[PDB]
Design an enzyme around this catalytic site. Structure first.
Site, PDB file in Angstrom:
ATOM      1  NE  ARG A  35      64.330  50.421 -40.471  1.00 35.36           N
ATOM      2  CZ  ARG A  35      63.293  51.101 -39.992  1.00 35.36           C
ATOM      3  NH1 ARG A  35      62.263  50.454 -39.467  1.00 35.36           N
ATOM      4  NH2 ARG A  35      63.284  52.426 -40.040  1.00 35.36           N
ATOM      5  CD  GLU A  88      69.174  57.075 -47.120  1.00 41.07           C
ATOM      6  OE1 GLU A  88      69.993  57.676 -47.849  1.00 41.07           O
ATOM      7  OE2 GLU A  88      69.480  56.072 -46.440  1.00 41.07           O
ATOM      8  NE  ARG A  96      90.413  58.614 -39.627  1.00 44.00           N
ATOM      9  CZ  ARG A  96      89.366  58.621 -40.446  1.00 44.00           C
ATOM     10  NH1 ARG A  96      88.339  59.427 -40.203  1.00 44.00           N
ATOM     11  NH2 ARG A  96      89.346  57.823 -41.504  1.00 44.00           N
ATOM     12  CE1 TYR A 109      75.204  48.570 -43.904  1.00 44.54           C
ATOM     13  CE2 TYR A 109      74.560  48.464 -41.603  1.00 44.54           C
ATOM     14  CZ  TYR A 109      74.757  49.192 -42.756  1.00 44.54           C
ATOM     15  OH  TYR A 109      74.505  50.543 -42.758  1.00 44.54           O
ATOM     16  CG  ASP A 156      80.171  48.634 -47.218  1.00 39.42           C
ATOM     17  OD1 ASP A 156      78.965  48.922 -47.053  1.00 39.42           O
ATOM     18  OD2 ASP A 156      81.064  48.952 -46.406  1.00 39.42           O
TER      19      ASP A 156
HETATM   20  C1  LIG Z   1      71.366  53.240 -49.346  1.00 40.68           C
HETATM   21  C2  LIG Z   1      72.662  52.362 -49.592  1.00 40.68           C
HETATM   22  C3  LIG Z   1      73.888  52.990 -49.758  1.00 40.68           C
HETATM   23  C4  LIG Z   1      75.049  52.228 -49.981  1.00 40.68           C
HETATM   24  N1  LIG Z   1      76.217  52.882 -50.136  1.00 40.68           N
HETATM   25  C5  LIG Z   1      77.353  52.176 -50.351  1.00 40.68           C
HETATM   26  C6  LIG Z   1      78.633  52.883 -50.523  1.00 40.68           C
HETATM   27  O1  LIG Z   1      78.669  54.100 -50.470  1.00 40.68           O
HETATM   28  N2  LIG Z   1      79.815  52.149 -50.747  1.00 40.68           N
HETATM   29  C7  LIG Z   1      79.766  50.726 -50.805  1.00 40.68           C
HETATM   30  O2  LIG Z   1      80.783  50.096 -51.000  1.00 40.68           O
HETATM   31  N3  LIG Z   1      78.509  50.033 -50.638  1.00 40.68           N
HETATM   32  C8  LIG Z   1      77.304  50.784 -50.409  1.00 40.68           C
HETATM   33  N4  LIG Z   1      76.099  50.149 -50.248  1.00 40.68           N
HETATM   34  C9  LIG Z   1      76.038  48.737 -50.294  1.00 40.68           C
HETATM   35  C10 LIG Z   1      75.953  48.025 -51.715  1.00 40.68           C
HETATM   36  O3  LIG Z   1      74.949  48.655 -52.493  1.00 40.68           O
HETATM   37  C11 LIG Z   1      75.812  46.488 -51.792  1.00 40.68           C
HETATM   38  O4  LIG Z   1      76.990  45.902 -51.477  1.00 40.68           O
HETATM   39  C12 LIG Z   1      75.456  46.042 -53.158  1.00 40.68           C
HETATM   40  O5  LIG Z   1      74.012  46.219 -53.464  1.00 40.68           O
HETATM   41  C13 LIG Z   1      75.884  44.593 -53.453  1.00 40.68           C
HETATM   42  O6  LIG Z   1      75.234  43.890 -54.517  1.00 40.68           O
HETATM   43  P1  LIG Z   1      74.456  42.611 -54.168  1.00 40.68           P
HETATM   44  O7  LIG Z   1      74.175  42.157 -55.673  1.00 40.68           O
HETATM   45  O8  LIG Z   1      75.119  41.585 -53.169  1.00 40.68           O
HETATM   46  O9  LIG Z   1      72.979  43.186 -53.820  1.00 40.68           O
HETATM   47  P2  LIG Z   1      71.965  43.940 -54.839  1.00 40.68           P
HETATM   48  O10 LIG Z   1      72.944  44.594 -55.819  1.00 40.68           O
HETATM   49  O11 LIG Z   1      70.797  44.806 -54.223  1.00 40.68           O
HETATM   50  O12 LIG Z   1      71.590  42.821 -55.927  1.00 40.68           O
HETATM   51  C14 LIG Z   1      70.380  42.177 -55.847  1.00 40.68           C
HETATM   52  C15 LIG Z   1      69.498  42.114 -57.112  1.00 40.68           C
HETATM   53  O13 LIG Z   1      68.846  40.868 -57.269  1.00 40.68           O
HETATM   54  C16 LIG Z   1      67.690  41.124 -57.987  1.00 40.68           C
HETATM   55  N5  LIG Z   1      66.725  40.147 -57.626  1.00 40.68           N
HETATM   56  C17 LIG Z   1      66.308  39.876 -56.381  1.00 40.68           C
HETATM   57  N6  LIG Z   1      65.391  38.891 -56.426  1.00 40.68           N
HETATM   58  C18 LIG Z   1      65.232  38.536 -57.706  1.00 40.68           C
HETATM   59  C19 LIG Z   1      64.441  37.597 -58.347  1.00 40.68           C
HETATM   60  N7  LIG Z   1      63.596  36.794 -57.625  1.00 40.68           N
HETATM   61  N8  LIG Z   1      64.506  37.474 -59.686  1.00 40.68           N
HETATM   62  C20 LIG Z   1      65.336  38.261 -60.398  1.00 40.68           C
HETATM   63  N9  LIG Z   1      66.113  39.176 -59.810  1.00 40.68           N
HETATM   64  C21 LIG Z   1      66.078  39.332 -58.470  1.00 40.68           C
HETATM   65  C22 LIG Z   1      67.275  42.555 -57.600  1.00 40.68           C
HETATM   66  O14 LIG Z   1      66.732  43.186 -58.761  1.00 40.68           O
HETATM   67  C23 LIG Z   1      68.430  43.158 -57.113  1.00 40.68           C
HETATM   68  O15 LIG Z   1      68.732  44.186 -57.989  1.00 40.68           O
HETATM   69  C24 LIG Z   1      74.974  50.877 -50.032  1.00 40.68           C
HETATM   70  C25 LIG Z   1      73.735  50.236 -49.864  1.00 40.68           C
HETATM   71  C26 LIG Z   1      72.584  50.993 -49.645  1.00 40.68           C
HETATM   72  C27 LIG Z   1      71.277  50.315 -49.465  1.00 40.68           C
HETATM   73  O1  LIG Z   2      75.343  60.117 -38.116  1.00 46.52           O
HETATM   74  C1  LIG Z   2      75.306  58.905 -37.870  1.00 46.52           C
HETATM   75  C2  LIG Z   2      75.750  57.972 -38.805  1.00 46.52           C
HETATM   76  C3  LIG Z   2      75.837  56.634 -38.439  1.00 46.52           C
HETATM   77  N1  LIG Z   2      75.131  56.196 -37.352  1.00 46.52           N
HETATM   78  C4  LIG Z   2      75.021  54.763 -37.040  1.00 46.52           C
HETATM   79  O2  LIG Z   2      75.992  54.034 -37.764  1.00 46.52           O
HETATM   80  C5  LIG Z   2      75.376  53.066 -38.585  1.00 46.52           C
HETATM   81  C6  LIG Z   2      76.130  52.941 -39.896  1.00 46.52           C
HETATM   82  O3  LIG Z   2      76.243  54.212 -40.487  1.00 46.52           O
HETATM   83  P1  LIG Z   2      76.514  54.296 -42.067  1.00 46.52           P
HETATM   84  O4  LIG Z   2      76.606  55.703 -42.517  1.00 46.52           O
HETATM   85  O5  LIG Z   2      77.732  53.534 -42.407  1.00 46.52           O
HETATM   86  O6  LIG Z   2      75.251  53.494 -42.657  1.00 46.52           O
HETATM   87  P2  LIG Z   2      74.858  53.494 -44.214  1.00 46.52           P
HETATM   88  O7  LIG Z   2      75.715  54.428 -44.980  1.00 46.52           O
HETATM   89  O8  LIG Z   2      75.068  52.120 -44.724  1.00 46.52           O
HETATM   90  O9  LIG Z   2      73.447  53.912 -44.357  1.00 46.52           O
HETATM   91  C7  LIG Z   2      73.952  53.545 -38.779  1.00 46.52           C
HETATM   92  O10 LIG Z   2      73.081  52.460 -38.970  1.00 46.52           O
HETATM   93  C8  LIG Z   2      73.665  54.235 -37.470  1.00 46.52           C
HETATM   94  O11 LIG Z   2      73.239  53.272 -36.533  1.00 46.52           O
HETATM   95  C9  LIG Z   2      74.686  57.111 -36.420  1.00 46.52           C
HETATM   96  O12 LIG Z   2      74.167  56.715 -35.381  1.00 46.52           O
HETATM   97  N2  LIG Z   2      74.814  58.462 -36.658  1.00 46.52           N
END
Ligand SMILES: Cc1cc2nc3c(=O)[nH]c(=O)nc-3n(C[C@H](O)[C@H](O)[C@H](O)COP(=O)(O)OP(=O)(O)OC[C@H]3O[C@@H](n4cnc5c(N)ncnc54)[C@H](O)[C@@H]3O)c2cc1C
Ligand SMILES: O=c1ccn([C@@H]2O[C@H](COP(=O)(O)OP(=O)(O)O)[C@@H](O)[C@H]2O)c(=O)[nH]1
Ligand SMILES: Cc1cc2nc3c(=O)[nH]c(=O)nc-3n(C[C@H](O)[C@H](O)[C@H](O)COP(=O)(O)OP(=O)(O)OC[C@H]3O[C@@H](n4cnc5c(N)ncnc54)[C@H](O)[C@@H]3O)c2cc1C
Ligand SMILES: O=c1ccn([C@@H]2O[C@H](COP(=O)(O)OP(=O)(O)O)[C@@H](O)[C@H]2O)c(=O)[nH]1
Lengths: 393, 393
Positions: free
Chosen positions: B258, B312, B181, B363, B365
């Protein structure tokens, strides 16, 4: 044979309209509202700029906020609200700072990041001159909250342009309007509910005065027509919301008021400062702040080749000037006490009530004005117009 | 005589539960959900810390946000949302900066205030090395948006700790997750709707799997029981949301993932950093960011003598590690194409569908995962379980 109206209301501000709306709808009475301005709403009157279409707050920016749920529920009867949260930035020495008091402002001004614990210690050292509990005026209260270095940089200068009065003479309540935090929260207000009227302020005010039992006469001064009107309705009380000292022809003296001048300009660019309100705390600039009204309603899509800004200038309110801020010095509070006596007397002799920002010489906000009007209705006006209870205790 | 279940779902994440809930309630079918974790919800599982009572997001902070009104209306069937707006601050050289790209960050880093027009010019000069339309990877895309000086200070270092991969090898879509922005808006997201589940994430997820036609078996790996289950329901399809490469026993090779490690600590102070999430962009610190969960729910009144924080850490996901982020290098996208072929084949031979973040190497959400699940239901699963339409086109 009977009476024309059941109540007279002077001023179509939030206080007057709240009073007029409650009496009309709840008690089923005819109310006459007299406004000398060409339009209703008082200083809350908004207007769309022709070139851009952007809603412009004509008499200074207005942001609604409250923690009173009763007030919140009441105002939502006439308008919807956006989820806008008001934030202000401060301009100092060619640099924009986060505002008000918080970890953002501290880490910027002092050059490095301070933890919440470290920040409390830093301010405690700089505020060792005076305790907050023993704060008499604005200057002492400000220092006891944010420390002297921040006081000189962001408060002392702004207060000079806004009030033109010695900081040791101004009330402490003025500076306590601003929240003092030790987090990165930079919300300018700290109330539960907050937002802007979705369809603008004028639409909101028109809904309150929409009832058929409410008549509003614009371009009408009460002092010019009260001689002819009151004989038509002798039993009808009068709610006055104009300048308190003007009502008695300044017989006891003139109260200190501050008035405002505005410069509205349409610019051939899409964005002037990238934020709604920018405070200018330095004295090398005549205006106190600048408003960019397009940032008030981000949900609306305005043209991106033009924008409307408004510079705000402050000066003493003279004879015919419209007052905005009560200065409330120790001399002012003394004179105020005299007028409150004259006002208490006028209530007993001719059923004239006094309320509102101007009618009470108070630094009131919109929600405080509405709450005040609700309390006057519930306790004073309703028992009188319905149960014959006298206006005085 | 007939079938036990009408559908198998592997994983109790937002994708799986959305699928399971739609099939059960709309088509009136029995669904078996298999989760190998001790609890449901996937990485969205929350848990209250005993000492403080504060809700802790166990697998990284989760903030819900979307511009899809259909998704927004759907999720509100199971939970309410607060009006929380997510904001992130960045730590660089012992100084906290406003984040992400905006007039706040620019005026802080460069030492003076820049107008929206002046800011656009400044960045345009520093981004003259590459155009945004011709951006191949993360490094080039980042520079073309915020300029090289800001890239070195806030992006290059953070990306190093988070990915441990050459910035020229990472997808450009990674950095475009952050809004760019030229205003003072520091909202980390730019979606229409945004908030946190009022009663926590676990309560939300339990409402989706609450239907009596949905059975959830915790602590159960699909690869251990699919030999015994599927004979019981031969006609029932399977929705797999686990690691895509693991499903085929890594036969074609291992995809780059990762994973994350967390350090949760209860501190004897009331406030650690005064904000929800603090990014650490410098390399002199092992962790990428710190969460302070009390700032996620300001509406709740937690004790002020204790607080919970979470550091983290990021590293490569190995054999038995739970994957969090798909790296998606050019080599990864190549291997992915191979598994998509094997997946397309498994759909035709044994009715096995692939979806979700892990199941598609995307990737994604939360809202993108739910929307994806809704599209799979409407177009693939519903016509099959109801109208006999084959799973493939
Ligand atoms: C650190 C982090 C922060 C995030 N923050 C946000 C956010 O702020 N806002 C947002 O909108 N999204 C966020 N996300 C993304 C979001 O968490 C994902 O979209 C979400 O996990 C989607 O659900 P999914 O079921 O597709 O994956 P997951 O929910 O991880 O579902 C997968 C599940 O399958 C199960 N599973 C895997 N293999 C097997 C097996 N062989 N047998 C039985 N069970 C199994 C696992 O137990 C796992 O729990 C974040 C992700 C991370 C990693
Ligand atoms: O302070 C920051 C935050 C974001 N990123 C880059 O932007 C990507 C996405 O950031 P985001 O916060 O959305 O990742 P998440 O919340 O999923 O961990 C990261 O992988 C980094 O490569 C960065 O370089 N600096
Ligand atoms: C620059 C500025 C910014 C503000 N911003 C905010 C904000 O962001 N949020 C908030 O909550 N509050 C804000 N306020 C405060 C708010 O505007 C007041 O609370 C509000 O005006 C209350 O209405 P009131 O009717 O008591 O006073 P007013 O609305 O000013 O009502 C008085 C009216 O009486 C009329 N009148 C006076 N004398 C006569 C007469 N003799 N005959 C006929 N009519 C007469 C006048 O025309 C005048 O319009 C702001 C105030 C100012 C000055
Ligand atoms: O940047 C600022 C803003 C506020 N004030 C002081 O705080 C008072 C109240 O500020 P506020 O913004 O609430 O006043 P208003 O919006 O009503 O004009 C002012 O009169 C000033 O004395 C200040 O010194 N510096």
């Amino acid at each position: 044979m009977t009476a024309r109206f059941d109540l007279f209301v002077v001023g179509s501000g939030f206080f007057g309209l709240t009073i007029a709306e409650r009496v009309a709808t709840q008690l089923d009475k005819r109310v006459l509202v007299l406004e000398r301005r060409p339009h209703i709403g008082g200083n809350a009157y908004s207007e769309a700029e022709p070139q851009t279409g952007i809603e412009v707050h004509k008499y200074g920016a207005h942001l609604f906020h409250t923690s009173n749920k009763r007030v919140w529920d009441y105002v939502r009867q006439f308008t919807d609200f956006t989820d806008y949260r008001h934030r202000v930035f401060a301009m100092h020495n060619g640099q924009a700072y986060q505002f008000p008091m918080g970890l953002g402002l501290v880490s910027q001004f002092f050059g490095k990041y301070f933890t919440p614990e470290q920040a409390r210690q830093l301010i405690a050292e700089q505020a060792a001159e005076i305790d907050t509990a023993d704060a008499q005026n604005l200057e002492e209260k400000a220092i006891s909250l944010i420390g002297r270095p921040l006081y000189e940089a962001f408060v002392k200068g702004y207060t000079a342009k806004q009030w033109q009065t010695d900081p040791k003479e101004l009330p402490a309540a003025n500076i306590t309007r601003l929240p003092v935090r030790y987090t990165f929260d930079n919300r300018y207000f700290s109330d539960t509910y907050e937002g802007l009227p979705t369809d603008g302020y004028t639409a909101w005010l028109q809904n309150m005065a929409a009832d058929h039992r409410i008549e509003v006469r614009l371009n009408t001064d009460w002092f010019d027509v009260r001689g002819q009107l009151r004989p038509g309705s002798p039993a009808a009380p009068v709610v006055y919301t104009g300048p308190l000292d003007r009502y008695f022809d300044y017989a006891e003296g003139r109260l200190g008021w501050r008035t405002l001048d505005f410069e509205v300009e349409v610019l051939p660019i899409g964005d002037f400062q990238g934020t709604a309100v920018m405070n200018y705390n330095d004295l090398d600039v005549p205006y106190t702040r600048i408003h960019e009204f397009r940032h008030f309603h981000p949900e609306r899509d305005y043209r991106t080749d033009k924008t409307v800004i408004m510079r705000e200038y402050s000066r003493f309110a003279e004879d015919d000037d419209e007052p905005y801020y009560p200065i409330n010095t120790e001399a002012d509070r003394a004179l105020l006490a005299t007028y409150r006596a004259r006002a208490k007397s006028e209530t007993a002799s001719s059923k004239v009530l006094f309320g509102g920002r101007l009618g009470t010489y108070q630094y009131l906000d919109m929600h405080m004005a509405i709450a005040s009007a609700l309390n006057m209705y519930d306790n004073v006006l309703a028992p009188h117009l319905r149960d014959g209870v006298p206006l005085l205790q």
